[PDB]
Amino acid sequence: TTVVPYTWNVGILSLIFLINVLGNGLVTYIFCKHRSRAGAIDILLLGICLNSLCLSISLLAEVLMFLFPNIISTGLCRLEIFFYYLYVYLDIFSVVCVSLVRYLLVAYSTRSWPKKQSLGWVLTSAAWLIALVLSGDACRHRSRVVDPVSKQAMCYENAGNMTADWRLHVRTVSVTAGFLLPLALLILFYALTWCVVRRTKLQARRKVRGVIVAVVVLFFVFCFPYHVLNLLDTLLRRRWIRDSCYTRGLINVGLAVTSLLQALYSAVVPLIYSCLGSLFRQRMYGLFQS
């Protein structure tokens, strides 16, 4: 059985695509118009918008394949899954980079190099290269297959006699490289920032930045559930926890619910900037008053 009907899934993904594209395109436009006077964390926060825009192509492809089964082909199956994994890796990598740069802003406060655009660009490129490698590795075999039992085409993991091995390998790579290690690095950098602040008893000149914290919190809100349920699913398919029809159906429902949350983070991200950021709020308010 399928948990979310066709109509609900298509509508939700279409609305998410619309808001994603509009919000992150506008944010990137404003950022490119005011680039010259930006900092490292500004570049990272723009990188989050670029990550969200990656998902737009994936969702557009998926929606067009739903609407038009006729155009389902190997090329679209590759492209959709490529952009999907690109988004999934890039979001967590960008959060890790944000944590790294705030660590560096305190570890090297006496230096000026932690606060330049150069650090943001270097970190963004380092994240993008890794995400591209990981996504391209996964999107190699997904092609057009026809089920004998229903005589309809669909995107599938067909890889020959080794289809199951590839199916397991892709999920294992996703879990290990896109949830576990990035989370450990994130925790490490925040713990180091807190430790260095505690050890120095840094003065009250430290004052909170509204935008940075909200995005990091809403990431753990809208995206973490999908990754944890993916980990549970992969544990099912590796027989590290016990099999059961009830458990399988429970996780089948859960994956359906949480996958929509993770896609909704793309729409959530630009709205955080449009309200908690003074520059984005002003500019977008002026644009919308036109």
Residue numbers in the entry: 42 to 331
Sentences from the paper on this structure:
Kaposi’s Sarcoma-associated Herpesvirus encodes ORF74, a viral G protein-coupled receptor homologous to CXCR2, which plays a crucial role in Kaposi’s Sarcoma development through its high basal signaling activity. ORF74 was identified as a homolog of the chemokine receptor CXCR2, which is a member of the class A GPCR subfamily. ORF74 has been shown to have robust and high basal activity for multiple signaling pathways. In this study, we present cryoEM structures of ORF74 in ligand-free, BRIL-fused ligand-free, and CXCL1 & Gitrimer(Gαi/Gβ1/Gγ2)-bound states, providing an inactive-active pair of structures of a vGPCR, allowing comparisons and insights into the likely conformational transitions.
To obtain the inactive structure of ORF74, we expressed and purified ORF74 without the agonist CXCL1. We optimized the sample for cryoEM by reconstituting the detergent-purified apo-ORF74 in nanodiscs (first panel). CryoEM analysis revealed homodimer formation in the nanodiscs, enabling structure determination at 2.9 Å resolution despite ORF74’s small size (~38 kDa). Unexpectedly, atomic modeling showed an antiparallel orientation of the two protomers, an uncommon feature among GPCRs, likely induced during purification. Nevertheless, the apo-ORF74 model from the antiparallel dimer showed a strong structural fit to the BRIL-fused ORF74 map, while the CXCL1 & Gitrimer-bound ORF74 differed significantly. This suggests that the apo-ORF74 structure represents a bona fide inactive conformation. To further investigate whether the apo conformation adopts an inactive form, we compared the apo protomer model of ORF74 with the known inactive conformation of CXCR240. An RMSD of 1.7 Å from their superposition suggested similarities between these two structures including the positioning of the ECL2, 7 TMs, and ICL3. Structural analysis of inactive ORF74 revealed a segmented TM6 helix, composed of distinct TM6a and TM6b regions.
